[PDB]
């Protein structure tokens with residue numbers, strides 16, 4: 001008897017969640033779980049904390065599956081703080097909870113769905129070596145994990161036979177006052193036909209407006225951006241130049257009713273696995289106030305059993321930082337008008353694009369030989 | 371117009387002192403005083419602080435440590451809650467190096483310097499006594515890593531690499547094997563930056579191995595010279611101290627002064643908008659605080675009880691005062707001061723460990739090679 | 741690890757050099773058996789020799 005709660009923010013098909021809760025086979029595992037669904041708005045951190053406290057005090061909740069619809073990022077940090085304070089684990093399946101955080105402390109029970117910065121950096125180079133763009137430059141601002149991105153990018157390209165000639169790096173800071181002139185002067189140093197960017201949505205919009213003022217965004221330069229710049233597919237800032245390439249999680253074929261079942265299955269299978277061998281189960285009085293003395297029963301073993309699970313012929317083996325190790329990504333391109341289209345999806349490290357030659361969007365010639 | 375600030379203290383008498391200080395500063399656009407107490411849990415702290423954030427729509431928050439010894443988690447709720455709104459926060463008695471990280475804590479300022487500057491002032495002793503070869507041991511923690519990195523970065527200019535860097539796991543009870551390796555080495559200067567508990571473990575093991583005889587030098591810091599370490603502590607240890615570290619009234623008497631100069635230059639510049647008082651209501655970011663941080667950090671303060679206070683581009687106080695603190699015959703006596711960038715002697719004479727009265731070379735020539 | 745005795749152009753040069761400077765020595769061969777280059781370990785930023 002383990003209680004699991006699910007929290008939704010914003011509009012969602014509530015009846016679909018109820019129908020899909022009992023959608024898998026959970027008979028041969030002694031979990032007998034109960035599903036509790038509660039809906040609330042995005043009022044504030046205080047409301048979220050109060051709701052979580054009330055729920056965990058109400059009926060024997062040992063874990064929370066959290067959903068969200070807004071694109072805010074600090075909600076992940078707040079949830080990580082809560083998970084650090086109380087030993088119960090929580091899961092982020094969609095929304096702002098899917099954003100990757102800087103560095104979870106050594107005592108946090110918190111996991112997210114979605115690739116990290118390093119895997120997206122790796123795929124940005126797998127995309128490059130297929131349409132033969134061997135010349136590129138990188139520009140980025142101050143964001144958590146910015147050093148890891150450039151470090152991995154530089155490490156990958158210096159241990160291969162193919163020749164990547166990296167033309168200068170830019171780590172400009174846009175938070176300075178009256179530094180816009182300096183930023184505009186520095187942006188003129190870019191010469192490679194391929195540009196890599198790592199910035200927040202508003203930072204990306206400001207930088208793109210500045211670049212369009214300079215004019216190096218019209219015909220021959222192509223930009224590649226990470227997942228977090230998009231955030232919401234529908235909300236097009238209208239400042240993004242045509243031809244932008246981005247990598248995003250496959251939300252088109254993987255909506256939400258399946259994610260709830262997948263998240264519940266992780267907890268159920270982990271609890272079943274840790275119960276049988278160890279003949280124990282963490283069932284403390286999950287108090288809300290005066291929780292410093294409630295840390296008597298260590299749940300670190302449950303954490304060790306949370307990082308290696310599988311079900312229905314799928315791999316969900318996590319890592320030390322708390323992310324997939326095996327996500328399912330897609331590649332999206334912004335066409336002539338403001339809209340996003342699927343170009344190619346790759347699984348198990350095998351790139352598969354639906355195009356063979358990049359559509360150009362005259363001094364481009366053809367050569368025949370023998 | 372009317373502008374109000376906020377603060378949280380750990381004593382009702384301290385609250386009255388803060389009220390008296392703000393009443394005195396009113397003679398220098400009228401200010402206000404808001405203060406609350408501390409709770410033994412972080413979630414209640416966050417709930418109260420955003421509840422009290424709604425109370426008066428504060429512009430700056432002052433935080434102080436409680437009588438608890440560790441208090442490592444006490445500043446965390448306020449920092450997270452304030453950074454959720456990008457509201458700058460000034461700290462008074464926080465010394466852990468975690469809060470110096472600009473990534474997790476975007477808005478945070480320090481009234482006292484961190485331990486990294488202690489590691490930096492360790493350099494002047496070597497500079498003035500011609501000690502070029504040292505052995506340093508630090509614990510496996512985020513605290514030690516920053517100090518080691520800063521020390522080796524500072525020593526990079528001198529092009530004098532330390533011979534050995536060795537570490538031990540935190541919270542251990544046996545370090546005999548590790549101390550064995552350093553005994554074989556050829557350096558006689560030991561610098562340790564560990565926790566208070568680990569200070570007792572290392573000091574006990576050093577005595578057994580005859581490690582603290584003649585011809586040895588120990589350079590320690592604030593944490594391992596206080597506490598229960600003096601129960602088992604050899605003579606001749608050279609420590610460190612701060613002139614006005616523990617006088618919370620001295621800081622407060624001028625902490626409100628430096629912020630008062632900043633608001634004068636901000637209230638009449640442009641586009642001033644009060645940060646929202648809607649704890650529950652608004653979830654956006656206040657426009658005021660990206661520019662407020664820039665002006666505040668560069669606000670030079672002419673003169674104060676602790677001298678000139680000028681902030682670098684790190685949110686940490688610069689030009690602190692250190693007293694080279696010495697122990698002889700089971701009591702501590704001052705022997706010098708750290709004048710900003712250099713040191714001067716004093717009337718008293720330092721007695722080195724082992725009873726010898728000289729300046730040990732810190733070197734023992736070896737006559738066997740490999 | 742079994743004791744062995746070595747001799748050659750380098751060994752007797754060391755003997756003559758050692759007698760001048762009044763020091764002793766205890767030679768031992770390398771374990772891996774390579775001259776040494778830089779390598780990337782465990783796919784990390786740091787690099788170490790062999």
Ligand SMILES: *[C@@H]1O[C@H](CO)[C@@H](O)[C@H](O)[C@H]1NC(C)=O
Nearest residue numbers: 677708709710711712713714
């Ligand atoms: C510190 O040393 C300098 C020497 O450059 C001296 O002028 C000054 O008076 C000393 N004391 C202080 C407080 O600066």
